[PDB]
């Protein structure tokens, strides 16, 4: 049972060096081929290169970035370094194995996303979204959570510490004038809220932000 797992920084500044790590378990990196792949904002997958069971490397010559691939056999890890990154290196990075008895990217990691930008990291403001103050209500109630003005991606959002998973839609973040905004909606029955408290838990690691925002009914 082979597993791969990428890790590395989420933000890097132009002209800096970026180093990612692929941690491998369940199989030794001295017996197969070990590759790096990235997915650009959009849908374009690009092959970058590999390091082989014997430590030999190959780099895709059509790349515009300058890369280096190395390994550590005592840890069963291998690495990808990008030299002098640019904004165009913003992407999601995957590691994947190519087997001698398979001959395809038969095992993949989950991927790690990297943003290359010189903009300063900014913490989000979390706003509750409660029903318009009129008291009429149907058979259900839809609440919301607005996370505005942060950088960079990503953020994580849960409801009631994950206990509330049904009837939840979280919308992908959008960039406007340099900062991201995303929102989430949750639907419950009429008698649940407000007698039962509902809270959106927002975390933004890049700014050390962790916020719990209770949804309070509106006062006239």
């Amino acid at each position: 049972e082979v597993q791969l797992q990428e890790s590395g920084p989420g933000l890097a500044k132009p002209s800096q060096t970026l180093s990612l790590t692929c941690s491998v378990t369940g199989s030794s990196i001295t017996s197969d081929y070990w590759n790096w792949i990235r997915k650009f904002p959009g849908n374009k997958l690009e092959y970058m290169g590999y390091i082989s069971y014997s430590g030999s490397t190959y780099y895709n010559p059509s790349l515009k970035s300058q890369i280096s691939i190395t390994r550590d056999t005592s840890k069963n890890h291998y690495y990808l370094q990008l030299n002098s990154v640019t904004t165009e290196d913003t992407a999601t990075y995957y590691c994947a194995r190519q087997g001698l008895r398979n001959w395809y990217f038969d095992v993949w990691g989950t991927g790690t996303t990297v943003t290359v930008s010189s903009a300063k990291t900014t913490a989000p403001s979390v706003y509750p979204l409660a029903p318009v103050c009129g008291g009429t209500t149907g058979s259900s109630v839809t609440l919301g959570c607005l996370v505005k003005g942060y950088f960079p991606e990503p953020v994580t959002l849960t409801w009631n510490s994950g206990s509330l998973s049904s009837g939840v839609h979280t919308f992908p973040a959008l960039l406007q004038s340099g900062l991201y905004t995303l929102s989430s909606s949750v639907t419950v029955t009429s008698n649940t809220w407000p007698s039962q408290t509902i809270t959106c838990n927002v975390a933004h690691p890049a700014s050390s932000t962790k916020v719990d925002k209770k949804i309070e009914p509106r006062v006239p």
Binding site: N60, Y94, W103, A130, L146, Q176, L182, S183, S185
Partner: protein, 218 residues
């Protein structure tokens, strides 16, 4: 380098039917007894997963619904019958020579019975008004097709500047979409108007769905 051209870029298919995705290479990838053209499936938030290797061999665990064929420069991936969880993006990839290259991808949309959205509107929070801004939010949940027009009106006057619309990926269970529409203003501009309305014109209804509130009505 070898170029892989996928077709179509987006493919809508109804449940139970079959989907046909093609992949054409600039040069042959077949050498003697083998063909080097593999297929992968990627779901939102997930990494791509291998489906078919060496043109027509099924990966272990992949349902029998998936099949592949082809040789030389033309290849095809078949899914019969398609199911809700197949909403995804599929990629072809060749192994004949270095550098390896991928196809542009094909998004598989599960055709769905036309469904109208459930619309909710939310005025700015007092916390945001403390900051000097004011965002009005409109949620449109569980509808289909994806395309849908949202129009904001301040005191009956249309407003299109300062609007952020975000769609979710196609739901893997009910095959619906949801979208969020946010209109952001300044506090002082929000306080010199009274009526705020989001109108949703969708193919599902002749007239638009309307949700509104008045600032001073509470």
């Amino acid at each position: 380098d070898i170029v892989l051209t996928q077709s179509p870029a987006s493919l809508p298919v109804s449940l139970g039917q079959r989907a046909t995705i093609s992949c054409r290479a600039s040069k042959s990838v077949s050498a003697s007894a083998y063909s080097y053209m593999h297929w992968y499936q990627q779901k939102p938030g997930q990494p791509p997963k291998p489906l078919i290797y060496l043109a027509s061999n099924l990966e272990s665990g992949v349902p029998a619904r998936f099949s592949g064929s082809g040789s030389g420069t033309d290849f095809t991936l078949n899914i019969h019958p398609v199911e809700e969880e197949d909403a995804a993006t599929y990629y072809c990839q060749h192994n004949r020579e270095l550098p390896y290259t991928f196809g542009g991808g094909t998004k598989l949309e599960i055709k769905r019975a036309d469904a109208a959205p459930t619309v909710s509107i939310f005025p700015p929070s007092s916390e945001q008004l403390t900051s000097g801004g004011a965002s009005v939010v409109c949620f449109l949940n569980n509808f289909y097709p994806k395309d849908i027009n949202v129009k904001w009106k301040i005191d009956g006057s249309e407003r299109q500047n300062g609007v952020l619309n975000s769609w979710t990926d196609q739901d893997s269970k009910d095959s619906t979409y949801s979208m969020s529409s946010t209109l952001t203003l300044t506090k002082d501009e929000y306080e010199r108007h009274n009526s705020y309305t989001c109108e949703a014109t969708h193919k599902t209804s002749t007239s638009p769905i309307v949700k509104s509130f008045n600032r001073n009505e509470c």
